[model samples]
Target chain A: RSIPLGVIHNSALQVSDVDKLVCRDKLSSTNQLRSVGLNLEGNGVATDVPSATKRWGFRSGVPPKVVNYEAGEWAENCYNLEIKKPDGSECLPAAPDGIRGFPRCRYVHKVSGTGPCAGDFAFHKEGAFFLYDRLASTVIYRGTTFAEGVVAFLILPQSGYYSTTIRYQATGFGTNETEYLFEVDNLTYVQLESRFTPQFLLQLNETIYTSGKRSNTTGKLIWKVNPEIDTWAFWETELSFTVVXXXXXX
Target chain B: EAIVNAQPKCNPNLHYWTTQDAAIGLAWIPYFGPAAEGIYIEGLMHNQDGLICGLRQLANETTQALQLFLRATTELRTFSILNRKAIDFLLQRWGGTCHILGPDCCIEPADWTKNITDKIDQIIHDFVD
Candidate 1:
């Protein structure tokens, strides 16, 4: 069997230069890059390999110079989740110590920018929130990618409070799809008269697709379950492969 | 204290010499060509050194790329660099008594596990701070 030997092709290489050519077949244990006519020494007499640009040619279906599934930089795009206040004013994550890991979503009062906990909410993704997960879950906030499943709503399990239950029957998936009329009655709670219990109001707005009719409703957060119906969960598109275009370098 | 031998996988032997002869006059001939002898010696000894250096450079670049890949892959794991506990534990697994920030207490690729994903968190910190 003829060993697969990559030829060095430079415009400068003439018939006389053939003898001077350092040609050798790859060893059985040659590295992946070397096997593909690419390495530090370069493809064909090209030296001084650019650390950023010249690399990743061998990486199948990945954009050149862009590390896949990693955030480009620590900036505003890295932070999409913000606390929406009851008074309609929104509060960004606290300064100095910006959002890191899964942060609890809360609302702020007009007096204090960082006010007391209003209602608990978070962009819930099942796996450990790695860079890839963070990018997929929190960062990419365009339509379907944002809320892809059953968004979590927690309640105090042990402490006695009012009956807490919230359920959403998505009308799109199953044959038994109907108008949203389901009550979640998972737990009941007993309020302690001594302490001043904080009451949180949550407004849910739904736009009817067929008729363009809008419905605005609110839920009181009294240690109750607020299971958010993730409408974007079912829709999934195959991630298309990306190749570095020749024009991209220009 | 344990004695550790930290030698380069490939020796750095840098050598390059062009025609030492000032002019292509008398030394251009065969038997009397002292320049020819010099050229032959340089080609035999010096050129080989340059070749070795070039190859070593290639290996270093390849290793650096692999290191970048490892770091990028490590980032796939949740809060890899941010979470110190898990990173530190993974590092100390093969790293033994070595500390990442401690002087001369760094782990090498040779010290890494043969398995790709295993202890990559440790390797990421090893490449980084």
Candidate 2:
């Protein structure tokens, strides 16, 4: 089947309080459908699979794999499950030398800066935090969120099989007028073993403020899963072998 | 590089002579008269050496003559001298050639130069008044 491509919707949804429903499913919630088939292993496949299974497939002669899934009742967005090989022992602690990927969450806050909350300031911080599989050199179960006006988080998983709850919050704009918040949660899963690395998973969130007139907020959570491994695996392996043999012969 | 002794240079008595014999060639052509033709030839000579250099040389000579003419008490005599200097410069740089003035009048280069020089001398002689 041909994938639908185009601007799905042009109008933005107006929400009274974005923070109130940060976790509420805006998309279809009833179905709870987890997976749709797409070749996450980089090989042609009909459906998406879990990242761990996909990584197992790689060790077992299959290419790297990922699973694309639709969540929330409305099915308004999509996400990917990355699979990675289980590292056989030999794990290291988190260090500052780890590579940081792209930003996972971005948010804007609109708060009334006056009255009891005149000096109040809201810090908007958004980020993704997850377990980095040092053995497999992959990230597993990454979550991201955005709080109006502070910082954006680019999360990387730590080594080993693990999960982390990621949250973005804001709390300085006003006494209690209104605040903007947005976030995403990913259940535990293995990252697909591939040369591809998880850059930041971006969750879009925005807040707006208006005086006298009713204000609203609206945004989207975007999860982009790209192949984490080099597609030219065989060529690279062959080239390495050739060099080794030539060195020995010489 | 070899150094060689050079012979002494000869300063020949360069007396500029103009007589009626040479004046026979001084007939005027309508468009190619001495003045017009001389200017045209000089312009070509200037261009041959590059426009900037030629223009600079011409400008320098003209300015020098004008300055002398302006400073002289005898206006006529100064003017004659100025004209001679200008013409002499041109003649030396661009050898005079025949100018086709008209169907009937054509002035040879030598004759044209003599005629121009004689006219300047005459003007100076009269300037004594």
Candidate 3:
């Protein structure tokens, strides 16, 4: 019971120095779940919260001065669900203003170079898209975190033009945080003369493994999901996590 | 009508401090020695006015390597100084915010923060260099 009581409970102790150190424990994802009893502040057991890094002298695993997420920025993390144009041109519109949220940014940027991402990031209409919990600390259309984080989605019954038959499935696990695919069929448009309806061109049933993931000394979790077979226009969602380094200060 | 003249979150506009401002020093604040005071002030700075991290890919999960770091800016520093009121106003009516970084929220200085800012910086430099 004599582990430093003030480390967390004594809020007045200057942990600015502690926050500066990267190796400080923020709770492992499973430990996070092992005790996910829905208390917002989260609770940790004393034995379970040992100085796990003591052997390393509480010095190893220290994160650099990198911003919480850039290797970690790109705030508001809006991303797209649309397929790329065959010519590979972006297929979305630009936001009228930049500072405030981009309702248009229901997806990632397509035009504004400094914007979230506007490319082929549509299908869900602006204002039509909704997050079940807008204030959730860890989840958003785009989210940023200093450690492990999670998010999920559900389409409202009458939001957009999609048919009620569209089914979106994803388990609340690490495997499919950004995997997405879609298809389109005719909605019976009145043609010039003949009774003919058109079908949308399907995109990649793609499979990819990031060649850039760090190896050897990797930590707690890594994932592999059998690729969605028969998937149309399959490319993993691009979620960026910035690993910020320290500038030469102190 | 609400926040007008109520002091600002951040003011990027350069304000020349007065001699009286420089003259005003000393507080009941536990100036617990340089390192103690530095850490203390730094803690407030972190909770109230925060800095961001620089990018480091070679970071360790089990160890820490102290190195020179660029102090990233804070949200408090981003009211777009020049635009000040205009920005916060836009942000207000739009009802936009970031990070679920809520609860037990924490610092401030359009009025008295300058004192804390100067102290934290002075000690950080003395020890850092």
Candidate 4:
């Protein structure tokens, strides 16, 4: 009974459209487990398992070893998404220009009914695994994004050491928004807390929405971290989201 | 000639040994010609062991020799993964050993084995000549 050993490389979890949205907007802010329906049945969670039988033969008691070794290499850096005003005056300074070659972040959803007069705003999903070289501050794994502004970045460590942080506006919906309040933390500990002022909220709201519906607004932030050197281990985290909808008769 | 004279005259057992050696030499002529002096003498010795066991009516010795033959055949067949002609020849000649002694006697044939052998044969035909 010789057991075979192998590693799965370059594998990705294809997030569904709904889950991608939920992850980007809902999970980024709330951090509430109940907001996302990950616990629901029949969501088609992907898994790696042994092939029990051939297409036309009887299945055997074949001992199969399925290990998600690709996950460990993905916990490298933290990504942060910053929404900008239409005038482009409100640009989130790219992650310390030389920290790692800054990867571009894109907008996912456009505000629909009654947002600020601004033409369009941007929201970003951040945090992804990266492979980096400390000698030249070069990123080897080019981060990518899926639909719904789900950004992925990879961070490679120098001698098995790396760090990252995610920052974004933290006020709730309506007139209480904050001025780009962000939380910074590393894999081992959290270093910041949620705090904001009414003035910051007013500034963020005036720049983001149109008719007070939080339209054309970009306040959601998602983070990811993937390291290159830890390629033979499994790493995963789940994010959830929630939204409040107020109804009125016209 | 004097060394021959110093040796004892061939007895019945010696005659059997000589005859068995001659038979094996004849059997191997097809693989290596008579002029090829690099015969596997140990293998020939084992074959003689089988013959002696058969002639002496020693069932235990016969079974032991048969086991040794099966073991040697298995070891030789192990290299079959490399040579198709030799593998095929061994299969056709001694495939029954698999059934008689269980699959442990020879490499068991399966879909994967067949597929691999076909792939090997294709590569040999395409690249080797």
The model with the greater TM-score, 2 or 4, is: 4
The candidate with the higher DockQ, 2 or 3, is 3
**Native contacts matched by each model:** 0.00, 0.00, 0.00, 0.00
Q: What tens-digit string does per-residue lDDT give for candidate 3 at A1-250?
A: 2211112324343223222423323322111111011211112211000111011111123221111111211122232222223355433333211112322221222111111222222221211221111111211122211111222221111134221122111111121222211221121111011111112111111111232322223232122222232111111113222222111100
Question: Model 3 chain B: which ten-residue window has the lowest total lDDT?
Answer: B49-58
Indicate the residue-level lDDT of A224 in model 2.
24
Count: clashes, candidate 1 = 6
User: Per-residue CA lDDT of candidate 2, range B1-112, in tens?
Assistant: 3222232332222223333222235455544445532433111132332444444445555677778746532222212555765765554333223236634334556788
List where candidate 2 sits over 4 angstroms from the true fold: A8-59, A65-102, A105-250, B1-129
Q: Which has the greatest DockQ?
A: 3
In model 1, the runs with Cα more than 4 Å from the true position are A1-80, A86-207, A214-250, B1-48, B56-71, B74-129
How does residue B121 of candidate 1 score in lDDT? 65
lDDT of 3 by residue, B1-129 (tens): 112222224332322322221223454344632343233321112222212111012122112322221133223232243474464454333322222334321223345667878678787878953
lDDT of each: 0.26, 0.25, 0.22, 0.26
C-alpha TM-score for every candidate: 0.20, 0.12, 0.17, 0.14
Scoring only the second chain, what is candidate 2's TM-score? 0.22
DockQ of 2: 0.00
Candidate 1 lDDT over A2-69, as tens digits, reads 23323334633122222233323111111211111111111121111011111111112322110123
* CAPRI grade of model 4: incorrect
Docking class of 2: incorrect
Q: What TM-score, to 2 decimals, does candidate 1 have?
A: 0.20
Per-residue lDDT tens digits for candidate 4, residues A173-234, read 11122222222211111111222222222333343234333322334332222222111111
